[PDB]
Symmetry: C3
Subunit: 227 residues, 3 copies
């Protein structure tokens, strides 16, 4: 029965959307992934199916909204390929929060449109929206309504990447600071209270420390220890 339920859901949304080539090529990535296909098969035996049918429509209305934004489509492929990110979306549809997901799906599109050929910020964007704890935190900040603070933190990160002097040492350190979910929420907390410039005041502090030690790999190891 589970094989018939899924292939019906496949042929249904496939036939209903033929003009959307970006959703057709993305739906097959979902089927070819045995880990996330295993989630769909467990969700039809659990008598959801509509939860899977609603998640397809959210991403179908997502690839249609962005349209020919290729730097956002590859994000969705990285997100929908992650079995935990794909499953926390299915759990944000059984809870009936398809709107909270759609909002977050668009604030990252705005960060991509604002990126403007900044592949270092794109890698940081992929790296945090693929972390289950960070991705849940971003959804939990949008359901409350504090959606612009996510845009505000995304901008402070985008500007901190530019305020690096092309120094790969500080960019790697900036990665290890924001990816840690404990420090990620602390920086979101300071942006939500108004310290959007004081959080940046510490990024310059760390960048100055990187340039102070500089070409000494031992002097830099202590800086990574000082966190």
């Amino acid at each position: 029965e589970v094989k018939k339920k899924l292939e019906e859901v496949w042929k249904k949304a496939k036939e209903d959307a033929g003009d959307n080539e970006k959703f057709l090529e993305l739906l097959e990535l979902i089927l070819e992934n045995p880990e996330i296909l295993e989630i769909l098969e467990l969700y039809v035996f659990i008598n959801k199916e509509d939860v899977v049918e609603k998640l397809f429509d959210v991403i179908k209305k997502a690839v249609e909204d962005a349209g020919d934004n290729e730097k956002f489509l590859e994000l969705l492929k990285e997100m929908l390929s992650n079995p935990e990110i794909f499953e926390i979306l299915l759990e944000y549809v059984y809870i009936k929060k398809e709107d909270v997901v759609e909002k977050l799906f668009e604030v990252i599109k705005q960060a991509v449109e604002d990126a403007g050929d900044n592949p270092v910020f794109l890698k940081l964007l992929k790296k945090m929206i693929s972390n289950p704890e960070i991705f849940e935190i971003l959804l939990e900040y949008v359901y409350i309504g504090k959606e612009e603070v996510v845009k505000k933190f995304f901008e402070v990160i985008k500007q901190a990447v530019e305020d690096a002097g092309n120094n790969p040492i500080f960019l790697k350190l900036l990665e290890k600071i924001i990816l840690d979910p404990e420090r990620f929420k602390k920086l979101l907390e300071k942006v939500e209270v108004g310290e959007e410039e004081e959080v940046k005041a510490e990024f310059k502090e760390i960048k100055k420390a990187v340039e102070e030690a500089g070409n000494d790999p031992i002097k830099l190891k202590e800086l990574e220890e000082k966190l």
Copy 2:
């Protein structure tokens, strides 16, 4: 020399078992996996070979006992593909505990026969028998002789999956509770003392809490924090 020793072990057990197609198709999965083939090559230079020869016979007598139980053969492929599970088996043969492995190999077959088209319990079964710490705990409970408590815990989990109301939130929470090896042994400890119904009394407590909060993703985050 190591290449000749292995291909001799290959052609030996291959020729001695031709009527067993399930062991022939499974032996090639072992050879095609470079990680676990690297374990076999280190075990012939270490002058075991018989340890590898005895492990093949255990799984050969395992695919023969289950026979055409396809829901158990895919388990063995998931277990024998894991390089740490495959290696902790080779270490339970040098210790001369090929019997303790055979018992555990059959209690999971009984959980599969008792499953009866319950793919959610099959995913939980794969998820815990692939954890090295959990797999060692299951072997260590059988060597003592307490083998039915493993069957007893497997049944309480199988029934807790059914006692979910098709709620994907509680099934994901039930997964994160039993996969943690520290909580896994605590639930095995309470089943070994007789509290087979009191452990279930807490599963209803958590399921009631899931339905209490329900469609609120913030109210559910605290429930996952209350562990």
Copy 3:
């Protein structure tokens, strides 16, 4: 622009080194790996390129020095395939420490030449030089000048593998002791002070404990707990 910068760097070093087949077949492994190719693309947008150009010359002068040492070329493939090891090398070139990398690249070649058909020590060598924390510690010990203590620890490990009696239990325990970066530096600290024989005195202590418990999987679990 980033696509043109890289293919220029590719065709440059490719044309300048045609007699070195080992560097040509290794350079294509770097390009075929999307994770580490993503690092190179972020390093040309960051206006390095020379950092990538210098890293290629370090490994080109590495495959040329070792020559037809196949047991060292497969090491470099395992190291250069790791996206974090490959990136911590790019950060040891922007710091202008291409010499500290070249030294460590040769002390592992000496451990391979001294290995002499000891595949258990080769697996331990791959396992620790692929750990980012351990690999950074090995670089940080060479930049100071304490390079022979790395050779000294590599020899004590190579001899501890032989002093195992072909016991797979103690070899797995010896693996879990040295791979832990906290214990890895403690053993390097005791070798740097002169206790090259006292660290070995504890390896016999653990091996004697393995043979004492022996064929009891419960008595051995406590030994792994006693760390």
